[PDB]
Design a protein around this nucleic acid. Sequence first.
DNA 1: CGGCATACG
DNA 2: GCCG
Length: 327
Amino acid sequence: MPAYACQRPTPLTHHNTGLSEALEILAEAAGFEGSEGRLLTFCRAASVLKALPSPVTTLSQLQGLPHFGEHSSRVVQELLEHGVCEEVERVRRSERYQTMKLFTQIFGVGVKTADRWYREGLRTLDDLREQPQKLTQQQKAGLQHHQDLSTPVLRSDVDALQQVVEEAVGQALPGATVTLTGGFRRGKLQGHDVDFLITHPKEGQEAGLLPRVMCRLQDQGLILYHQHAFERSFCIFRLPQPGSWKAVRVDLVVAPVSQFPFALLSWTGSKLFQRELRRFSRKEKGLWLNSHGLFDPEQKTFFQAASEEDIFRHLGLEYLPPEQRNA
DNA sequence: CGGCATACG
DNA sequence: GCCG
Ligand SMILES: O=c1ccn([C@@H]2O[C@H](COP(=O)(O)OP(=O)(O)OP(=O)(O)O)[C@@H](O)[C@H]2O)c(=O)[nH]1
Ligand SMILES: [Cl-]
Ligand SMILES: [Cl-]
Ligand SMILES: [Mg+2]
Ligand SMILES: [Mg+2]
Ligand SMILES: [Mg+2]
Ligand code: NA
């Protein structure tokens, strides 16, 4: 079992679901306390279990697996022996965890804002609604739409939404294309949002595109919230439903075609997969990876990629399709 | 021990 | 919290 998640296939569904879920609770709680390192270790340990070919049934099967030391091994040991880990259950029921989870789930509220509200004594969404002078416009939209945004987006919803985005994109710039990315590209059946990547086959034509797209969608009455030159939009869209509609989070990103493989790789995820790939690139290969390119800081050159396959090859990694990037 | 991903809004 |  290699140490980086980008070195091994990780499918969406696997054979250690309960164990991985428990470790991810501890990872999430570590993040709420500001410990990024602990969060990463617990996330990495969970992801190792997702990559195994069969269920862990005995503690001895953890021997030699990366990211399993005394703490993660004890969690697994307790789940195997008793079906429950006391530390995990204590986190689950804790007021701190439940409130930080509730607050950070809001679009526009991160850990730092949630923590400050927690320390001020706030606990519920109605607590926040009763003090709207303390909210940004983004947070107000996140709070007004919180209920709809807490409902999973279905893969059945995605097709309808891609068609409306394509219509606006085609008027904004004929020939521009829309690609589904994020979790749905990795095979998820549900999501918290829909992620799209937009480009045009003629380098340079995509400059200035996203404002033109957003203005068109707003004129069609489909935008419930957006932030307004720009190239990324994190919006709330109106999606039709039987006799009504619901609010859905949609992310739109524009990239030049020369950067498209890098942007597609970056926005397809998973989040852990991308962090691990970027860490691998820098620490093992001495190359700096981001959503725009892959840089050699010694030669001061960028690697020209025509496909995600090119990028895996240039990092010396076996290619993983999106469905195997569910780290 | 140092390190832990990344840039745009 | 774990790796090198
Ligand atoms: O902190 C982050 C968040 C997101 N991303 C990049 O943005 C992509 C989309 O980020 P999302 O937050 O939309 O996640 P997701 O689509 O994988 O899963 P859902 O919760 O939406 O179902 C991610 O898959 C990752 O590639 C990061 O690189 N870092
Ligand atoms: Cl590999
Ligand atoms: Cl690390
Ligand atoms: Mg998504
Ligand atoms: Mg998104
Ligand atoms: Mg230390
Ligand atoms: Na949030």
